[PDB]
Design a protein around this ligand. Structure first.
Ligand code: ZHO
Length: 127
Protein backbone atom coordinates (compact mmCIF):
# COMPACT_ATOMS: atom_id res chain seq x y z
CA UNK A 1 0.00 0.00 0.00
CA UNK A 2 0.98 3.61 -0.66
CA UNK A 3 0.32 7.11 0.67
CA UNK A 4 -0.36 9.99 -1.76
CA UNK A 5 2.04 12.88 -2.05
CA UNK A 6 1.32 15.41 0.70
CA UNK A 7 -0.47 18.70 0.06
CA UNK A 8 1.86 21.31 -1.35
CA UNK A 9 3.51 23.57 1.13
CA UNK A 10 5.67 25.71 -1.18
CA UNK A 11 5.14 26.96 -4.73
CA UNK A 12 7.52 29.60 -6.18
CA UNK A 13 4.87 30.82 -8.59
CA UNK A 14 2.16 31.37 -5.97
CA UNK A 15 1.76 34.96 -4.76
CA UNK A 16 1.98 35.54 -1.01
CA UNK A 17 1.68 38.16 1.67
CA UNK A 18 2.73 38.79 5.27
CA UNK A 19 -0.20 40.17 7.16
CA UNK A 20 -1.08 40.69 10.79
CA UNK A 21 -3.90 38.11 10.42
CA UNK A 22 -1.56 35.50 8.96
CA UNK A 23 0.93 36.25 11.74
CA UNK A 24 -1.85 35.71 14.31
CA UNK A 25 -2.82 32.45 12.62
CA UNK A 26 0.74 31.14 13.16
CA UNK A 27 1.62 32.70 16.52
CA UNK A 28 -1.68 32.25 18.29
CA UNK A 29 -4.11 29.96 16.42
CA UNK A 30 -1.77 27.24 15.18
CA UNK A 31 0.37 27.45 18.33
CA UNK A 32 -2.58 26.97 20.65
CA UNK A 33 -4.00 24.02 18.72
CA UNK A 34 -0.60 22.45 18.23
CA UNK A 35 0.05 22.35 21.99
CA UNK A 36 -3.36 20.92 22.87
CA UNK A 37 -3.65 17.47 24.29
CA UNK A 38 -5.63 16.35 21.22
CA UNK A 39 -3.23 17.70 18.57
CA UNK A 40 -1.34 14.50 17.87
CA UNK A 41 -3.62 12.92 15.20
CA UNK A 42 -3.59 16.25 13.36
CA UNK A 43 0.09 17.24 13.41
CA UNK A 44 0.98 15.50 10.15
CA UNK A 45 -0.67 14.06 7.04
CA UNK A 46 -2.52 10.83 7.75
CA UNK A 47 -0.05 7.96 7.16
CA UNK A 48 -2.67 5.56 5.86
CA UNK A 49 -0.10 2.83 5.32
CA UNK A 50 1.36 2.87 8.86
CA UNK A 51 -2.03 3.35 10.47
CA UNK A 52 -3.61 0.56 8.42
CA UNK A 53 -6.35 2.92 7.09
CA UNK A 54 -6.27 1.82 3.43
CA UNK A 55 -9.60 3.47 2.71
CA UNK A 56 -8.56 6.92 4.03
CA UNK A 57 -7.45 8.47 0.73
CA UNK A 58 -10.29 6.74 -1.11
CA UNK A 59 -12.76 8.76 1.04
CA UNK A 60 -10.67 11.91 1.64
CA UNK A 61 -9.71 13.66 -1.55
CA UNK A 62 -8.80 17.06 -0.09
CA UNK A 63 -6.53 16.06 2.81
CA UNK A 64 -5.27 18.72 5.24
CA UNK A 65 -3.44 18.66 8.55
CA UNK A 66 -1.76 21.08 10.97
CA UNK A 67 1.73 19.98 9.89
CA UNK A 68 0.95 21.15 6.39
CA UNK A 69 -0.67 24.36 7.70
CA UNK A 70 2.39 25.07 9.86
CA UNK A 71 4.67 24.65 6.85
CA UNK A 72 2.43 26.85 4.67
CA UNK A 73 2.51 29.58 7.28
CA UNK A 74 6.26 29.35 7.87
CA UNK A 75 7.10 29.05 4.16
CA UNK A 76 5.08 32.19 3.32
CA UNK A 77 2.67 30.22 1.13
CA UNK A 78 -0.54 32.14 1.69
CA UNK A 79 -1.97 35.32 0.15
CA UNK A 80 -4.70 35.69 2.74
CA UNK A 81 -6.06 34.52 6.08
CA UNK A 82 -9.09 32.95 4.49
CA UNK A 83 -6.93 30.39 2.69
CA UNK A 84 -5.48 29.32 6.03
CA UNK A 85 -8.85 29.31 7.85
CA UNK A 86 -10.15 27.16 4.98
CA UNK A 87 -7.33 24.69 5.52
CA UNK A 88 -8.26 24.32 9.22
CA UNK A 89 -11.91 23.88 8.25
CA UNK A 90 -11.00 21.23 5.65
CA UNK A 91 -9.02 19.39 8.31
CA UNK A 92 -12.05 19.30 10.65
CA UNK A 93 -14.52 18.43 7.92
CA UNK A 94 -12.38 15.58 6.65
CA UNK A 95 -12.35 14.08 10.14
CA UNK A 96 -16.15 14.21 10.31
CA UNK A 97 -16.48 12.66 6.83
CA UNK A 98 -14.04 9.77 7.32
CA UNK A 99 -15.04 8.76 10.85
CA UNK A 100 -18.41 8.13 12.54
CA UNK A 101 -20.53 9.85 15.15
CA UNK A 102 -19.12 9.61 18.61
CA UNK A 103 -15.78 8.22 17.46
CA UNK A 104 -12.79 9.07 19.63
CA UNK A 105 -11.15 11.21 16.95
CA UNK A 106 -14.38 13.06 16.14
CA UNK A 107 -14.67 14.14 19.75
CA UNK A 108 -11.04 15.34 19.57
CA UNK A 109 -11.65 17.28 16.37
CA UNK A 110 -14.79 18.88 17.87
CA UNK A 111 -12.84 20.10 20.90
CA UNK A 112 -10.06 21.51 18.65
CA UNK A 113 -12.62 23.15 16.39
CA UNK A 114 -14.33 24.86 19.35
CA UNK A 115 -10.94 26.21 20.46
CA UNK A 116 -10.11 27.28 16.89
CA UNK A 117 -13.33 29.25 16.63
CA UNK A 118 -12.64 30.93 20.00
CA UNK A 119 -9.25 32.06 18.72
CA UNK A 120 -10.72 33.21 15.36
CA UNK A 121 -13.01 35.56 17.30
CA UNK A 122 -9.91 37.44 18.41
CA UNK A 123 -8.48 37.63 14.82
CA UNK A 124 -7.04 41.15 14.70
CA UNK A 125 -8.47 43.72 12.29
CA UNK A 126 -6.27 43.88 9.12
CA UNK A 127 -3.78 46.79 9.04
C1 ZHO B 1 -9.02 6.42 12.88
N1 ZHO B 1 -9.07 7.69 12.19
C2 ZHO B 1 -8.02 8.54 12.19
N2 ZHO B 1 -6.93 8.23 12.82
C3 ZHO B 1 -5.90 9.16 12.85
C4 ZHO B 1 -4.68 8.80 13.55
N3 ZHO B 1 -3.59 9.60 13.45
C5 ZHO B 1 -2.64 8.98 14.23
C6 ZHO B 1 -1.32 9.34 14.47
C7 ZHO B 1 -0.54 8.50 15.21
C8 ZHO B 1 -1.06 7.34 15.82
N4 ZHO B 1 -0.15 6.52 16.51
C9 ZHO B 1 0.56 7.16 17.62
C10 ZHO B 1 1.77 6.33 17.97
N5 ZHO B 1 1.37 4.98 18.38
C11 ZHO B 1 2.55 4.16 18.72
C12 ZHO B 1 0.57 4.33 17.34
C13 ZHO B 1 -0.61 5.18 16.94
C14 ZHO B 1 -2.37 6.99 15.61
C15 ZHO B 1 -3.15 7.81 14.81
N6 ZHO B 1 -4.45 7.72 14.35
C16 ZHO B 1 -5.43 6.74 14.86
C17 ZHO B 1 -6.29 7.34 15.96
C18 ZHO B 1 -7.23 6.53 16.60
C19 ZHO B 1 -8.08 7.06 17.59
C20 ZHO B 1 -7.99 8.33 18.01
C21 ZHO B 1 -7.06 9.13 17.43
C22 ZHO B 1 -6.22 8.63 16.41
C23 ZHO B 1 -5.97 10.40 12.25
N7 ZHO B 1 -7.15 10.73 11.66
C24 ZHO B 1 -7.63 11.85 11.08
C25 ZHO B 1 -6.84 13.09 10.94
N8 ZHO B 1 -8.88 11.65 10.64
N9 ZHO B 1 -9.25 10.38 10.96
C26 ZHO B 1 -8.21 9.81 11.57
Amino acid sequence: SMNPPPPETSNPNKPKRQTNQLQYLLRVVLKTLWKHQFAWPFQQPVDAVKLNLPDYYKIIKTPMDMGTIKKRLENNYYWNAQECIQDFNTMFTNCYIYNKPGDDIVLMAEALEKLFLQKINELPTEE
